[PDB]
Amino acid sequence: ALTQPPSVSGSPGQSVTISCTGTSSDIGSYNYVSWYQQHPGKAPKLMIYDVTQRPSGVSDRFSGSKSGNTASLTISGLQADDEADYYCSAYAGRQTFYIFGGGTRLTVL
Amino acid sequence: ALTQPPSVSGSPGQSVTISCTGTSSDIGSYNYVSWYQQHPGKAPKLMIYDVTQRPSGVSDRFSGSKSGNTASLTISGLQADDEADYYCSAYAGRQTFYIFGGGTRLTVL
Amino acid sequence: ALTQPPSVSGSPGQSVTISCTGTSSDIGSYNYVSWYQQHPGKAPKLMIYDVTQRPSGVSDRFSGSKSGNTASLTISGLQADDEADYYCSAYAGRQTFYIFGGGTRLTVL
Amino acid sequence: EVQLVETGGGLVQPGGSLKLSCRASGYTFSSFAMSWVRQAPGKGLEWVSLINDRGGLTFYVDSVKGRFTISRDNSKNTLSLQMHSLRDGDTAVYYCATGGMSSALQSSKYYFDFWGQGALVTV
Amino acid sequence: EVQLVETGGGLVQPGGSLKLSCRASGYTFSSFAMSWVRQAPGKGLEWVSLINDRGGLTFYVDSVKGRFTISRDNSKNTLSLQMHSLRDGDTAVYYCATGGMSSALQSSKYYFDFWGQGALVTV
Amino acid sequence: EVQLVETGGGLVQPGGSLKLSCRASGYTFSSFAMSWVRQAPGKGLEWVSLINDRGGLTFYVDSVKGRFTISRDNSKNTLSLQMHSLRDGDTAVYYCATGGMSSALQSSKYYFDFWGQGALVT
Amino acid sequence: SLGFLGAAGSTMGAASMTLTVQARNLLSGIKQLQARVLAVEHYLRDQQLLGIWGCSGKLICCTNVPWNSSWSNRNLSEIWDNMTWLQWDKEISNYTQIIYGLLEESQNQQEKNEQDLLALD
Amino acid sequence: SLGFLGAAGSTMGAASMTLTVQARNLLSGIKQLQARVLAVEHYLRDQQLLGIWGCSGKLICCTNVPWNSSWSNRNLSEIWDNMTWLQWDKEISNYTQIIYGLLEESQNQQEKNEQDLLALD
Amino acid sequence: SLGFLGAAGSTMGAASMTLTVQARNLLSGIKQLQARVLAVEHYLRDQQLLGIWGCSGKLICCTNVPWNSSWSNRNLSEIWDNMTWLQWDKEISNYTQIIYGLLEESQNQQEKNEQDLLALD
Ligand SMILES: *[C@@H]1O[C@H](CO)[C@@H](O)[C@H](O)[C@H]1NC(C)=O
Ligand SMILES: *[C@@H]1O[C@H](CO)[C@@H](O)[C@H](O)[C@H]1NC(C)=O
Ligand SMILES: *[C@@H]1O[C@H](CO)[C@@H](O)[C@H](O)[C@H]1NC(C)=O
Ligand SMILES: *[C@@H]1O[C@H](CO)[C@@H](O)[C@H](O)[C@H]1NC(C)=O
Ligand SMILES: *[C@@H]1O[C@H](CO)[C@@H](O)[C@H](O)[C@H]1NC(C)=O
Ligand SMILES: *[C@@H]1O[C@H](CO)[C@@H](O)[C@H](O)[C@H]1NC(C)=O
Ligand SMILES: *[C@@H]1O[C@H](CO)[C@@H](O)[C@H](O)[C@H]1NC(C)=O
Ligand SMILES: *[C@@H]1O[C@H](CO)[C@@H](O)[C@H](O)[C@H]1NC(C)=O
Ligand SMILES: *[C@@H]1O[C@H](CO)[C@@H](O)[C@H](O)[C@H]1NC(C)=O
């Protein structure tokens, strides 16, 4: 599994970064790190796909990047409707296809 | 190895069943569970091959079955000559070919 | 790593044997062993390659052999200029190419 | 416009066998690879199984490699997962998702682009 | 009608090399695959090695994979097992048997239909 | 007559990436396979990586397999080792050595016949 | 060796040991050229057929098409030990094209499946 | 099935599913002989070329030569879903020999690499 | 590139790098038709021979037949660096058919052995 902060928080309008850290055999070697937003009671929604691409329909406030073996997602201009459980995932290879990290509870102050 | 009862018993004429329990990659996947009768001091004799087949020359009183990961041999009409050490074995695959269980001592009361 | 004595010693003119012990998967199966002479402060020089071969330029005093899983170096006619750390090595396979032992300090008495 | 609906029961017992059948619409079913992922009630997401667009190739996480079968019927637009043994540790919400792989002549995926609502399965 | 006779040494010190040769009669030797099965005096049966009918393919139990060689001479109807290292744990009665495999064009085996008398090898 | 001369720095911070190179002369460069072997100051010799004569095939010990890249350029007669991660157990004198493999049209090697002087990396 | 077709009267199993002999004898004004060209066209059509099935370099090639019983319900002993290839040919003639069609379909699926697996990083 | 060349107007992706149909149709008084021989020569030259690349037994053969973009800057959907093979052949004609040359070099290196790997005891 | 047969005077090692040059040039009114048909028959006989040995898709085919020394007692440097292929062909002429026979036998065992390995569940 990938290492993830159990929770993060911030005030509306602030930039909040969630950092997902893996290893060289997964996040490092493969440029396929996706992010998902799961509201309680709902299925996860795709928020980021590829290392830096955003799905159509997702606002420009959601972005991300990768450096070394650490990948991160940043939400600038945080809104009240952003409170959710965020997940990171990455492609690991042919024997192990996908590895998910722990969840991050994002709370809006 | 496969797990078998250390011993079983019954009265003459009684049906006695010896079971052997394995995992899904052993008895479960491959329907090749044979049984052998080893008299003390003698080489094992083949009694059952395949899940339900019996070599010619072996009495109709010896039969068996497979369910899930459990294989069994039922000996009906127990005779005094049936006192022996019984073993089951199964084909496990290409890396490990055959697995034998512990011996079961069948005694006639 | 390979098993090799931490040190050996003898007087000038003495025959000194340095043993090296491995396992069946390396020195036993493969007849690809070698010995190196490393003087302090210098890079190792090749003394023996193959089980019994010697590079051109090496004196006939340096010889060796292999029996089972044990290989050895013998230095006849020991000279003061032979004081050095000796290493054994062997080819292990396609997955692991070379395995070295520890060093043996050869001191001239 | 894409909807995925997981139909199946929600309560079994250890050693049971169950099946979940996910219906899908709003896209060409045969054009996307599909997968199942799970979420334990108190945990995050876990990948369970992946099937190709044609259905010929299947992949499983080691924890279910010898227990689960994933298949798809491209004429009925249905993705089915059949569970066997169903050890208590398999209690989770099982989500049907589209994506995770592509058939060599398509752009790469390596992400799950459409999600259903999730079938809660209790052992 | 089928007989298997095992001839070989009964005592070897540790690290020794020994040979056991099982000669067969009463059936066509070259038509059956054969194997060796070991039984320590206080243990049950353990499979040790398997050889094809032609002798081209050999398989071993992991415990002996780097130390035992199985071969057969189809003109003399003799199956031989050459043991090396012969570590203490290899003290047992060894049996030769037919079966355990078939050459693709034959019905399957995966059982040992004929057993010899065996030979006790003390390490 | 045969000389192998290692070039590169000897001190890098942990998590840094360093590159070593080796120039060679006195033989046909393209005819021999080469490798890097390392020795911690207080330890014996350890093989690190091997490259073929043509440079198309590389082999590494598992402990460095995902962090080191070995390459060669047969026109400049140079063999280079690029290290990444550079975790501490990797402090050693790194020796440039010729041998360890052959082209299948040459006699067997499986020994290192020429050694350089070694670049000490802390 | 019994030579070309020497195993024709032998059982299917025994005759499998002579597959290379017949293969060699498939290659080794107008009338002579037509006979030579015809031999070449027949050889190549058979090799193309093996290629489509993924058997281009084999004399014995195992496939993933199951036997459907209707084609022949004989067991392995009857087919390989008690029959010749001529008898089998006659017995299986009415199903040869069906089998060939299935073999083509099987290879096509495998090629696509292989292509997809090689696309996984 | 659409028959021989029935996929010619289909997309490259869809058309890739009918390769065996055309494959069968490359093989199946002086003029008749000469044309039969010519058909054989063209078939063999293409099969020989595939053999040079290590593709002798496959209709869909993956290689280790990267696409250089200059040859075609289209995306995968633009090529496989929005184009026919006729359009591609016209678009890529000027680079066909370049690609073939690279394929030859790649296989040559691969054979040496295999030869060396098989020489490690 | 040295061109067709340009490596003929080079050492066997160096010459092994130009195998595709001669391979391409093996394929590239009665008299015209007889000669081109003959070229096809020779090509196919060599390809069939490689096929029997399991070398149908390779130019450098590494097999499992040991060298018996009597055929030639030269070491690898004496053969690959100090000789051309013409000299080797002259030296090994009397053993060519022996080697070919052994190659056939070796492949036959491998195919049968593979058939048995694929019969283990
Ligand atoms: C012909 O059949 C007989 C029956 O005994 C058998 O012995 C013989 O080998 C067969 N001939 C060939 C060429 O296989
Ligand atoms: C076997 O043949 C029958 C007709 O005899 C057909 O209905 C059936 O689908 C076939 N089965 C398979 C698995 O090909
Ligand atoms: C093949 O079909 C013909 C049609 O007349 C029939 O006579 C013959 O018996 C069939 N053969 C088999 C083996 O079913
Ligand atoms: C021709 O193009 C149309 C466009 O809709 C498509 O439906 C049809 O399948 C195409 N024909 C072929 C033979 O692919
Ligand atoms: C692509 O082709 C151009 C010439 O059109 C050449 O200069 C360039 O090096 C090629 N790129 C690669 C990566 O081979
Ligand atoms: C190919 O070359 C010709 C030379 O006249 C040129 O007209 C044509 O546009 C070229 N095609 C491509 C696709 O580059
Ligand atoms: C001919 O031999 C000489 C050495 O005498 C060598 O330099 C030259 O390259 C050779 N020519 C070829 C084509 O190999
Ligand atoms: C080598 O060939 C000779 C005949 O020239 C033969 O007697 C000998 O057995 C062969 N050696 C091997 C190992 O096959
Ligand atoms: C082949 O045999 C003939 C028999 O006369 C002999 O003259 C010739 O030298 C032999 N060639 C080789 C290469 O052994």
Side-chain angles (χ1 to χ4, degrees):
Chain A
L2 304 170
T3 87
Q4 186 85 299
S7 66
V8 163
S9 286
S11 295
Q14 295 188 304
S15 210
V16 61
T17 297
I18 302 170
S19 297
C20 179
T21 301
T23 188
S24 170
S25 68
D26 322 320
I27 292 207
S29 34
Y30 296 90
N31 64 34
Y32 304 120
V33 154
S34 63
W35 294 81
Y36 302 125
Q37 179 181 215
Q38 182 175 42
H39 287 326
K42 303 294 144 288
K45 180 177 176 62
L46 179 67
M47 265 314 112
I48 297 314
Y49 68 94
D50 192 336
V51 181
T52 86
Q53 275 73 31
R54 185 173 67 251
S56 177
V58 179
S59 297
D60 198 281
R61 293 187 299 108
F62 289 84
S63 68
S65 70
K66 185 174 86 81
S67 178
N69 297 21
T70 189
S72 325
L73 176 148
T74 81
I75 298 110
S76 287
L78 196 173
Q79 274 45 70
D81 293 334
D82 288 8
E83 179 155 354
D85 308 308
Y86 288 81
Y87 303 100
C88 60
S89 68
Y91 178 79
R94 289 191 294 273
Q95 288 76 330
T96 167
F97 275 80
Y98 296 77
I99 55 171
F100 285 90
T104 283
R105 303 210 47 99
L106 205 59
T107 88
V108 54
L109 304 173
Chain B
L2 301 172
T3 65
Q4 296 185 210
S7 66
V8 304
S9 289
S11 296
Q14 186 170 9
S15 293
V16 55
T17 299
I18 301 169
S19 64
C20 35
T21 36
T23 189
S24 150
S25 64
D26 276 91
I27 277 161
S29 35
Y30 298 103
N31 92 81
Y32 305 116
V33 311
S34 62
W35 293 81
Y36 302 88
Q37 181 220 17
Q38 183 173 43
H39 292 109
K42 264 63 61 182
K45 189 187 322 303
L46 179 67
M47 289 328 188
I48 300 293
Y49 72 100
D50 274 333
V51 280
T52 312
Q53 295 340 304
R54 49 168 77 78
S56 297
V58 177
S59 172
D60 290 17
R61 294 186 299 107
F62 292 82
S63 68
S65 64
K66 185 180 88 80
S67 46
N69 299 322
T70 284
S72 65
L73 172 67
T74 300
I75 326 178
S76 70
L78 182 68
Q79 302 206 8
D81 204 48
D82 295 2
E83 186 150 351
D85 265 348
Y86 290 80
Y87 302 89
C88 66
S89 66
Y91 177 71
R94 214 184 304 200
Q95 292 75 310
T96 191
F97 276 80
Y98 298 96
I99 57 173
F100 285 88
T104 297
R105 302 220 43 92
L106 170 63
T107 187
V108 181
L109 296 179
Chain C
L2 300 171
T3 292
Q4 186 179 330
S7 66
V8 298
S9 66
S11 295
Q14 186 175 337
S15 293
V16 54
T17 299
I18 282 187
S19 66
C20 180
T21 302
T23 188
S24 66
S25 69
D26 58 31
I27 286 165
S29 180
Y30 296 102
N31 293 58
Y32 299 120
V33 301
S34 63
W35 294 84
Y36 299 88
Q37 178 175 83
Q38 183 174 41
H39 292 286
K42 298 213 311 293
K45 181 175 73 27
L46 179 67
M47 297 331 288
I48 298 175
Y49 68 92
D50 260 33
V51 285
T52 62
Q53 295 305 143
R54 70 175 39 76
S56 297
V58 176
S59 173
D60 308 318
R61 292 188 300 107
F62 292 81
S63 68
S65 69
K66 185 174 83 82
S67 178
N69 296 269
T70 166
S72 65
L73 184 43
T74 86
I75 303 168
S76 69
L78 182 68
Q79 261 65 71
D81 293 338
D82 298 336
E83 197 204 2
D85 291 347
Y86 289 98
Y87 301 91
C88 65
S89 68
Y91 177 78
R94 209 189 292 90
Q95 82 296 14
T96 299
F97 277 40
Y98 300 100
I99 71 194
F100 288 88
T104 284
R105 181 64 58 69
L106 171 76
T107 187
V108 181
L109 304 175
Chain D
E1 202 251 355
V2 174
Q3 304 49 28
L4 304 201
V5 282
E6 303 90 43
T7 68
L11 178 163
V12 169
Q13 284 296 288
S17 300
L18 190 79
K19 183 167 75 173
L20 314 89
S21 294
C22 178
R23 305 211 71 274
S25 67
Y27 65 91
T28 37
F29 185 78
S30 65
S31 158
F32 294 78
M34 299 185 25
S35 69
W36 291 86
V37 303
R38 67 183 177 186
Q39 182 167 28
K43 214 52 61 183
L45 303 168
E46 177 96 355
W47 173 81
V48 176
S49 64
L50 173 67
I51 188 162
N52 203 354
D53 56 349
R54 292 188 304 281
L57 300 173
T58 62
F59 309 96
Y60 303 96
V61 67
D62 318 64
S63 148
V64 284
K65 198 173 282 223
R67 309 180 301 89
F68 290 18
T69 295
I70 185 169
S71 324
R72 62 188 290 160
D73 184 292
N74 287 337
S75 69
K76 296 181 183 72
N77 299 52
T78 81
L79 178 77
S80 296
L81 176 66
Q82 185 175 64
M83 328 193 84
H84 278 5
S85 165
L86 276 177
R87 59 176 182 183
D88 61 356
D90 295 352
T91 296
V93 185
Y94 285 83
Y95 296 99
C96 177
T98 301
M101 175 174 126
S102 38
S103 92
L105 309 169
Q106 295 183 233
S107 297
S108 64
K109 291 284 179 182
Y110 303 106
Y111 59 91
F112 307 116
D113 56 41
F114 299 104
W115 294 73
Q117 296 307 270
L120 82 173
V121 183
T122 36
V123 172
Chain E
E1 294 180 354
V2 175
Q3 299 84 228
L4 298 174
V5 153
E6 297 88 298
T7 88
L11 176 64
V12 48
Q13 313 288 39
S17 295
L18 173 67
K19 184 182 290 189
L20 316 173
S21 297
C22 175
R23 185 170 300 107
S25 65
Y27 66 110
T28 36
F29 180 76
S30 65
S31 295
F32 288 73
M34 287 157 38
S35 186
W36 292 84
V37 181
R38 183 171 70 179
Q39 183 171 28
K43 302 293 184 182
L45 301 174
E46 199 221 6
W47 173 83
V48 176
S49 65
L50 174 66
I51 188 163
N52 205 353
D53 54 297
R54 293 188 306 281
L57 301 172
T58 60
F59 308 95
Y60 304 117
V61 67
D62 289 345
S63 294
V64 302
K65 188 175 283 177
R67 62 182 75 169
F68 291 1
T69 295
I70 186 168
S71 67
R72 61 189 290 162
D73 157 31
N74 285 337
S75 70
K76 296 181 183 72
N77 296 326
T78 166
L79 173 68
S80 64
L81 177 65
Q82 175 70 334
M83 289 138 286
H84 283 1
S85 193
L86 268 164
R87 316 173 176 190
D88 295 277
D90 303 350
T91 289
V93 53
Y94 287 78
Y95 297 94
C96 63
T98 62
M101 208 178 60
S102 267
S103 69
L105 307 182
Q106 296 181 313
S107 297
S108 65
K109 290 287 185 183
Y110 304 114
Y111 60 87
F112 306 107
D113 46 63
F114 298 130
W115 294 68
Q117 308 78 346
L120 173 69
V121 198
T122 81
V123 166
Chain F
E1 192 256 332
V2 174
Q3 88 155 5
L4 305 178
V5 283
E6 298 88 320
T7 324
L11 178 63
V12 71
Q13 303 328 352
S17 158
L18 192 58
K19 183 177 182 182
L20 301 65
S21 66
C22 178
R23 169 135 300 101
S25 67
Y27 58 64
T28 48
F29 184 78
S30 65
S31 294
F32 293 77
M34 312 210 224
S35 69
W36 289 90
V37 178
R38 70 183 177 188
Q39 181 170 29
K43 301 292 186 181
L45 302 174
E46 182 183 10
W47 171 80
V48 176
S49 65
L50 184 145
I51 188 162
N52 203 355
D53 57 349
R54 293 188 306 281
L57 306 181
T58 61
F59 306 94
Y60 304 89
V61 296
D62 278 18
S63 68
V64 302
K65 188 175 284 178
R67 66 184 182 277
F68 290 5
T69 188
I70 187 169
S71 272
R72 64 188 290 162
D73 179 271
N74 288 338
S75 295
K76 295 183 328 304
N77 297 321
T78 166
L79 157 77
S80 64
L81 177 65
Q82 175 70 334
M83 293 183 284
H84 283 1
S85 193
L86 268 164
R87 316 173 176 190
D88 238 331
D90 298 358
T91 173
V93 48
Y94 286 81
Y95 293 96
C96 178
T98 300
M101 205 185 121
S102 36
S103 72
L105 304 182
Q106 294 174 320
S107 295
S108 297
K109 288 285 185 182
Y110 305 107
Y111 59 87
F112 306 111
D113 53 359
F114 299 98
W115 294 72
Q117 298 65 28
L120 186 173
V121 153
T122 36
Chain G
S1 176
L2 299 173
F4 178 70
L5 296 158
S10 280
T11 63
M12 290 174 63
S16 69
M17 307 305 168
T18 57
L19 296 172
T20 60
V21 176
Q22 284 74 235
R24 288 194 298 273
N25 288 283
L26 300 202
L27 295 174
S28 295
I30 295 295
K31 285 223 302 180
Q32 188 177 44
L33 286 168
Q34 288 176 341
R36 292 228 311 274
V37 171
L38 183 63
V40 171
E41 299 191 308
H42 288 169
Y43 177 80
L44 293 174
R45 288 174 179 173
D46 283 349
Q47 293 298 307
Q48 183 178 51
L49 183 60
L50 291 172
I52 287 168
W53 296 344
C55 301
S56 67
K58 300 183 182 131
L59 298 175
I60 301 172
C61 180
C62 298
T63 76
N64 204 77
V65 176
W67 193 256
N68 193 32
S69 296
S70 294
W71 300 344
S72 177
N73 204 341
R74 293 186 182 277
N75 63 17
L76 292 171
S77 179
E78 289 149 21
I79 295 168
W80 292 104
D81 295 321
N82 210 5
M83 290 184 354
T84 70
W85 279 99
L86 291 165
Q87 290 171 312
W88 177 253
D89 209 12
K90 290 178 231 294
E91 289 216 3
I92 202 67
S93 205
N94 300 40
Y95 305 103
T96 197
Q97 295 301 313
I98 293 167
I99 294 167
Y100 290 1
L102 291 169
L103 291 170
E104 174 175 300
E105 281 166 39
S106 180
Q107 186 63 44
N108 288 341
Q109 291 177 20
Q110 291 179 19
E111 289 185 344
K112 290 294 293 184
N113 289 340
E114 181 174 10
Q115 184 178 33
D116 292 350
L117 290 168
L118 290 172
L120 296 172
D121 304 76
Chain H
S1 176
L2 299 71
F4 177 69
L5 297 200
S10 279
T11 63
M12 290 170 69
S16 72
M17 302 301 207
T18 58
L19 296 172
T20 60
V21 176
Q22 286 71 236
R24 297 185 270 240
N25 280 67
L26 295 174
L27 295 174
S28 177
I30 195 68
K31 290 193 181 323
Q32 290 77 326
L33 221 27
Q34 289 169 345
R36 288 165 68 186
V37 171
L38 183 62
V40 170
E41 290 205 300
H42 288 169
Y43 176 80
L44 293 174
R45 180 173 14 272
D46 283 343
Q47 289 288 359
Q48 190 271 338
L49 183 61
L50 291 172
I52 293 174
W53 299 342
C55 299
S56 66
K58 301 142 91 184
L59 297 176
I60 301 173
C61 180
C62 297
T63 72
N64 219 333
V65 176
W67 191 256
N68 191 20
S69 295
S70 293
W71 299 342
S72 178
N73 224 336
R74 293 180 184 272
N75 297 334
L76 290 171
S77 66
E78 288 172 40
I79 296 168
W80 292 103
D81 295 309
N82 291 318
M83 292 183 353
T84 58
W85 277 101
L86 291 165
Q87 290 171 50
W88 178 252
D89 168 9
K90 290 177 218 178
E91 180 169 349
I92 202 68
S93 197
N94 299 44
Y95 307 103
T96 296
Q97 295 301 313
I98 293 167
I99 293 167
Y100 292 177
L102 291 170
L103 292 170
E104 185 190 280
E105 311 186 349
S106 180
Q107 185 63 19
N108 287 342
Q109 292 178 23
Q110 162 167 311
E111 290 187 21
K112 291 289 306 153
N113 289 341
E114 290 177 0
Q115 184 179 36
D116 293 352
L117 290 169
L118 292 172
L120 294 170
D121 289 345
Chain I
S1 176
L2 299 174
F4 178 70
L5 301 178
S10 291
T11 63
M12 307 178 11
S16 73
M17 286 303 148
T18 58
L19 295 172
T20 61
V21 175
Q22 286 71 236
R24 289 194 251 117
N25 287 284
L26 297 204
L27 294 168
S28 295
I30 295 295
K31 289 179 62 210
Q32 293 82 327
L33 189 56
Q34 288 171 340
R36 72 199 293 176
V37 170
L38 182 62
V40 170
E41 314 182 332
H42 288 305
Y43 176 80
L44 293 175
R45 288 171 184 164
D46 285 339
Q47 292 296 308
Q48 171 176 268
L49 184 61
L50 292 172
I52 291 307
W53 298 344
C55 299
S56 67
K58 294 175 271 183
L59 298 176
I60 301 173
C61 180
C62 182
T63 171
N64 192 31
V65 177
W67 192 255
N68 190 20
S69 83
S70 293
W71 299 342
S72 269
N73 206 347
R74 292 180 182 273
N75 68 348
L76 290 172
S77 149
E78 287 169 80
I79 296 168
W80 291 102
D81 297 7
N82 291 322
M83 298 184 344
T84 67
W85 277 101
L86 290 165
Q87 290 171 2
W88 177 252
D89 179 37
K90 288 175 221 169
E91 180 171 350
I92 201 67
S93 270
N94 294 26
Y95 306 104
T96 285
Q97 295 301 315
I98 293 167
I99 294 167
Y100 291 181
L102 292 170
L103 292 169
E104 178 192 320
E105 177 38 48
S106 181
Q107 187 63 44
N108 287 343
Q109 291 178 23
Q110 290 170 43
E111 276 175 347
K112 186 69 178 178
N113 288 340
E114 291 176 9
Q115 185 178 32
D116 292 350
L117 289 169
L118 292 171
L120 296 173
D121 289 345

